Write a protein that holds these residues in place. Structure first.
Motif, PDB file in Angstrom:
ATOM      1  N   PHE A 148      23.753  -9.041 -15.674  1.00  0.00           N
ATOM      2  CA  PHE A 148      23.972  -7.664 -15.281  1.00  0.00           C
ATOM      3  C   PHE A 148      23.784  -7.441 -13.791  1.00  0.00           C
ATOM      4  O   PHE A 148      24.571  -6.719 -13.189  1.00  0.00           O
ATOM      5  CB  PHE A 148      23.028  -6.742 -16.055  1.00  0.00           C
ATOM      6  N   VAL A 149      22.766  -8.023 -13.171  1.00  0.00           N
ATOM      7  CA  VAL A 149      22.523  -7.764 -11.756  1.00  0.00           C
ATOM      8  C   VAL A 149      23.418  -8.616 -10.870  1.00  0.00           C
ATOM      9  O   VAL A 149      24.045  -8.115  -9.937  1.00  0.00           O
ATOM     10  CB  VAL A 149      21.031  -7.976 -11.434  1.00  0.00           C
ATOM     11  N   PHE A 150      23.535  -9.906 -11.164  1.00  0.00           N
ATOM     12  CA  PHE A 150      24.250 -10.816 -10.288  1.00  0.00           C
ATOM     13  C   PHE A 150      25.622 -11.208 -10.802  1.00  0.00           C
ATOM     14  O   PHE A 150      26.363 -11.852 -10.055  1.00  0.00           O
ATOM     15  CB  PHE A 150      23.423 -12.073 -10.057  1.00  0.00           C
ATOM     16  N   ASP A 151      25.966 -10.835 -12.040  1.00  0.00           N
ATOM     17  CA  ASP A 151      27.285 -11.064 -12.652  1.00  0.00           C
ATOM     18  C   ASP A 151      27.634 -12.553 -12.670  1.00  0.00           C
ATOM     19  O   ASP A 151      28.777 -12.958 -12.470  1.00  0.00           O
ATOM     20  CB  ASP A 151      28.366 -10.224 -11.960  1.00  0.00           C
ATOM     21  N   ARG A 152      26.623 -13.372 -12.906  1.00  0.00           N
ATOM     22  CA  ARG A 152      26.761 -14.815 -12.962  1.00  0.00           C
ATOM     23  C   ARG A 152      25.798 -15.320 -14.018  1.00  0.00           C
ATOM     24  O   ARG A 152      24.814 -14.642 -14.336  1.00  0.00           O
ATOM     25  CB  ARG A 152      26.460 -15.450 -11.601  1.00  0.00           C
ATOM     26  N   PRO A 188      21.111 -20.071 -13.663  1.00  0.00           N
ATOM     27  CA  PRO A 188      20.675 -21.456 -13.593  1.00  0.00           C
ATOM     28  C   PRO A 188      19.742 -21.710 -14.761  1.00  0.00           C
ATOM     29  O   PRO A 188      18.888 -20.882 -15.080  1.00  0.00           O
ATOM     30  CB  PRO A 188      19.947 -21.521 -12.253  1.00  0.00           C
ATOM     31  N   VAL A 189      19.938 -22.842 -15.428  1.00  0.00           N
ATOM     32  CA  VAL A 189      19.131 -23.118 -16.605  1.00  0.00           C
ATOM     33  C   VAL A 189      17.706 -23.436 -16.190  1.00  0.00           C
ATOM     34  O   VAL A 189      16.752 -23.019 -16.852  1.00  0.00           O
ATOM     35  CB  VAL A 189      19.786 -24.244 -17.420  1.00  0.00           C
ATOM     36  N   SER A 190      17.537 -24.094 -15.043  1.00  0.00           N
ATOM     37  CA  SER A 190      16.210 -24.414 -14.542  1.00  0.00           C
ATOM     38  C   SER A 190      15.425 -23.181 -14.133  1.00  0.00           C
ATOM     39  O   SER A 190      14.197 -23.195 -14.236  1.00  0.00           O
ATOM     40  CB  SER A 190      16.308 -25.375 -13.364  1.00  0.00           C
ATOM     41  N   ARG A 191      16.088 -22.107 -13.717  1.00  0.00           N
ATOM     42  CA  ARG A 191      15.355 -20.892 -13.392  1.00  0.00           C
ATOM     43  C   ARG A 191      14.850 -20.171 -14.624  1.00  0.00           C
ATOM     44  O   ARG A 191      13.718 -19.674 -14.618  1.00  0.00           O
ATOM     45  CB  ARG A 191      16.216 -19.959 -12.549  1.00  0.00           C
ATOM     46  N   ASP A 225      25.607 -25.102 -16.070  1.00  0.00           N
ATOM     47  CA  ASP A 225      25.676 -24.195 -14.935  1.00  0.00           C
ATOM     48  C   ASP A 225      26.386 -24.925 -13.799  1.00  0.00           C
ATOM     49  O   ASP A 225      27.159 -25.857 -14.040  1.00  0.00           O
ATOM     50  CB  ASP A 225      24.277 -23.648 -14.589  1.00  0.00           C
ATOM     51  N   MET A 259      25.172 -26.863 -11.533  1.00  0.00           N
ATOM     52  CA  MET A 259      24.661 -28.197 -11.271  1.00  0.00           C
ATOM     53  C   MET A 259      24.983 -29.184 -12.379  1.00  0.00           C
ATOM     54  O   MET A 259      24.416 -30.278 -12.397  1.00  0.00           O
ATOM     55  CB  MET A 259      23.152 -28.138 -11.047  1.00  0.00           C
ATOM     56  N   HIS A 302      22.394 -29.565 -18.512  1.00  0.00           N
ATOM     57  CA  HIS A 302      20.952 -29.713 -18.394  1.00  0.00           C
ATOM     58  C   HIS A 302      20.301 -29.757 -19.761  1.00  0.00           C
ATOM     59  O   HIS A 302      20.673 -29.003 -20.658  1.00  0.00           O
ATOM     60  CB  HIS A 302      20.340 -28.572 -17.592  1.00  0.00           C
ATOM     61  N   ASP A 314      16.782 -25.915  -6.051  1.00  0.00           N
ATOM     62  CA  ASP A 314      17.396 -26.354  -7.291  1.00  0.00           C
ATOM     63  C   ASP A 314      18.912 -26.441  -7.205  1.00  0.00           C
ATOM     64  O   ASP A 314      19.570 -26.598  -8.237  1.00  0.00           O
ATOM     65  CB  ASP A 314      16.978 -25.437  -8.440  1.00  0.00           C
ATOM     66  N   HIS A 316      21.063 -24.120  -6.475  1.00  0.00           N
ATOM     67  CA  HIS A 316      21.753 -22.888  -6.820  1.00  0.00           C
ATOM     68  C   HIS A 316      21.624 -21.906  -5.672  1.00  0.00           C
ATOM     69  O   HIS A 316      20.514 -21.603  -5.230  1.00  0.00           O
ATOM     70  CB  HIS A 316      21.185 -22.292  -8.105  1.00  0.00           C
ATOM     71  N   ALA A 351      27.784 -12.744  -5.968  1.00  0.00           N
ATOM     72  CA  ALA A 351      26.480 -12.391  -6.515  1.00  0.00           C
ATOM     73  C   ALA A 351      25.737 -11.426  -5.604  1.00  0.00           C
ATOM     74  O   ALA A 351      25.072 -10.506  -6.088  1.00  0.00           O
ATOM     75  CB  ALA A 351      25.640 -13.642  -6.750  1.00  0.00           C
ATOM     76  N   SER A 381      27.356  -8.146  -6.145  1.00  0.00           N
ATOM     77  CA  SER A 381      27.010  -7.483  -7.396  1.00  0.00           C
ATOM     78  C   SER A 381      25.585  -6.961  -7.387  1.00  0.00           C
ATOM     79  O   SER A 381      25.324  -5.875  -7.913  1.00  0.00           O
ATOM     80  CB  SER A 381      27.209  -8.420  -8.572  1.00  0.00           C
ATOM     81  N   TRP A 382      24.646  -7.745  -6.841  1.00  0.00           N
ATOM     82  CA  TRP A 382      23.288  -7.261  -6.627  1.00  0.00           C
ATOM     83  C   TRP A 382      23.292  -6.004  -5.787  1.00  0.00           C
ATOM     84  O   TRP A 382      22.552  -5.057  -6.065  1.00  0.00           O
ATOM     85  CB  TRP A 382      22.435  -8.317  -5.926  1.00  0.00           C
ATOM     86  N   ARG A 441      24.533  -3.043  -7.707  1.00  0.00           N
ATOM     87  CA  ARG A 441      23.476  -2.549  -8.582  1.00  0.00           C
ATOM     88  C   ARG A 441      22.429  -1.776  -7.813  1.00  0.00           C
ATOM     89  O   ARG A 441      21.969  -0.737  -8.287  1.00  0.00           O
ATOM     90  CB  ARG A 441      22.806  -3.698  -9.337  1.00  0.00           C
TER      91      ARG A 441
END
Lengths: 240, 216
Positions: A97-101, A104-107, A138, A140, A143, B79, B81, B87, B90-91, B94
């Motif tokens: 919702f915030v970043f529309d992406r 990352p699975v690690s995050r 993702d 990278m 994972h 990492d 990313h 992004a 979009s941030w 928001r």
């Protein structure tokens, strides 16, 4: 008989430098059925073995959807796995919702570990008696993550958690030198042969007990249930 | 911000073949007074995102603070990313909509230029949350006085080189110097390409005043 002064709560250090409630929650995951996770260069497959309360009951779910790119599999207390799924699904929704992406699975895995460290240190609350095995795709690549009740998380080439999953790790460490160059069907068959070796001699992988979850590059996370594991199990070999 | 105090005027932006170039003059006006004459209205977000802003400059400094701390906190993880330009866009959509919905806007109008995965990004966000992406952007009076030149060139020629886009941006900044009374003859031009974000400036316009003698 040998009653322990220090395994009372999670906020007690033993004089040996240990926290016994964290250690005892670490073997709440060996109270769960086995689950193999493994990744190729393009895909990440979670294979789990699930059990039924009776022949008329319908085989407790172990792979759970978290997002279109993240799917996990559980071993241990399925009540704590539900808290963890609700948390992880909401974090995936919040950053789509915030970043529309996608996450990352690690995050997300770091964020799980920061969540589950809090009951390992605060009074009157137990550690999460579940270990997760987290497949994701993702930017990278794919994972495979393991999270444990000790709130320690692991980035894995392949991993097995659950009861008598040593034998799968003996399979997986032996065969991890060719996981990356597999296609999808051979990666699923490696995960099944790892799962098939967490079985006794009379038991076999059937369509009712095997659940397979695959995420990939051009593939969203999909759980393959009863009829859907038939393409994946009717290409294996007889038990050696 | 119910009432903007020191505002910045138009911020341009256009995609070219290989990146985005944005510009903004280096003036923050208090009303009509050209009070703050060497302030940079263009942020470098990260390696692949740059951000120029109109409106209240204290709100843009707030967004610089918040978004730069987000970029720092992201780069600490190591990492692999990174926040994409989409992004960040979009941030920021928001953020501006969330401040709008509390009836406490950030009085800004922002151009987010970027270049990730060999694809250019150019994004408009204003104080109400109206966001879109376009091959050429222009806030303030640039939407009236520069976006015509930008969109007519992008109509004749959809794919610009970096030199053509740079000359077009300079040419629109000259028009905005002639006709916008809050503009100023000193501007930065920021470019994002594969080589990262470079901020060039202060640049000036070539003035022509031959029509001043055509009055008799």
């Amino acid at each position: 008989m040998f009653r322990n002064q220090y395994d009372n709560d999670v906020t007690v250090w033993s004089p040996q430098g240990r926290i016994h409630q964290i250690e005892y929650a670490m073997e709440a995951v060996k109270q769960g059925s086995a689950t193999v996770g493994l990744k190729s260069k393009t895909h990440a497959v979670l294979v789990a073995l699930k059990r039924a309360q009776s022949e008329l009951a319908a085989h407790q779910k172990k792979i759970l959807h978290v997002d279109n790119h993240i799917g996990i599999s559980i071993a241990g207390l399925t009540a704590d796995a539900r808290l963890l799924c609700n948390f992880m699904r909401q974090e995936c929704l919040d950053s789509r919702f915030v970043f529309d992406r996608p996450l990352p699975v690690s995050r997300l895995v770091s964020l799980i570990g920061s969540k589950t460290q809090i009951p390992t240190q605060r009074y009157g609350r137990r550690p999460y008696g579940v270990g997760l095995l987290i497949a994701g795709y993702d930017d990278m690549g794919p994972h495979i993550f393991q999270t444990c009740p000790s709130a320690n998380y692991f980035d894995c080439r392949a991993m097995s958690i659950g009861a008598r999953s040593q034998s799968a790790r003996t399979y997986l460490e032996r065969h991890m030198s060719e996981f990356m160059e597999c296609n999808l069907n051979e990666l699923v068959k490696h995960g099944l042969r790892a799962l098939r070796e967490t079985l006794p001699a009379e038991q076999d992988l059937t369509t009712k007990n095997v659940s397979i979850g695959i995420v990939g590059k051009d593939l969203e996370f999909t759980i393959y249930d009863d009829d859907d594991v038939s393409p994946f199990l009717e290409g294996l070999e007889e038990r050696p | 911000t119910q009432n903007p105090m020191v505002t910045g005027t138009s911020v341009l932006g256009v995609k070219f073949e290989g990146g985005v170039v944005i510009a903004a003059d280096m003036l923050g006006s208090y009303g009509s007074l050209a009070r703050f004459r060497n302030i940079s209205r263009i942020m470098r977000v990260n390696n692949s995102t740059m951000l120029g802003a109109s409106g209240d400059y204290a709100d843009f400094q707030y967004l610089k603070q918040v978004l730069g701390q987000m970029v720092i906190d992201e780069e600490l993880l190591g990492d692999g990313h990174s926040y994409s330009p989409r992004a960040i866009h979009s941030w920021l959509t928001r953020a501006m909509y969330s401040r709008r919905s509390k009836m406490n806007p950030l009085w800004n109008t922002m151009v987010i230029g970027g270049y990730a995965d060999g694809e250019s990004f150019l994004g408009y966000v204003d104080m109400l949350g109206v966001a879109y992406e376009a091959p050429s952007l222009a806030t303030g009076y640039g939407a009236y006085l520069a976006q015509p030149l930008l969109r007519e060139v992008l109509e004749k020629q959809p794919v610009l080189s970096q030199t053509e886009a740079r000359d077009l941006v300079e040419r629109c900044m000259r028009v905005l110097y002639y006709r916008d009374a809050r503009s100023y003859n000193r501007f930065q031009i920021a470019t994002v390409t594969e080589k990262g974000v470079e901020i060039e400036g202060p640049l000036s316009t070539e003035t022509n005043w031959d029509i001043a003698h055509m009055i008799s």
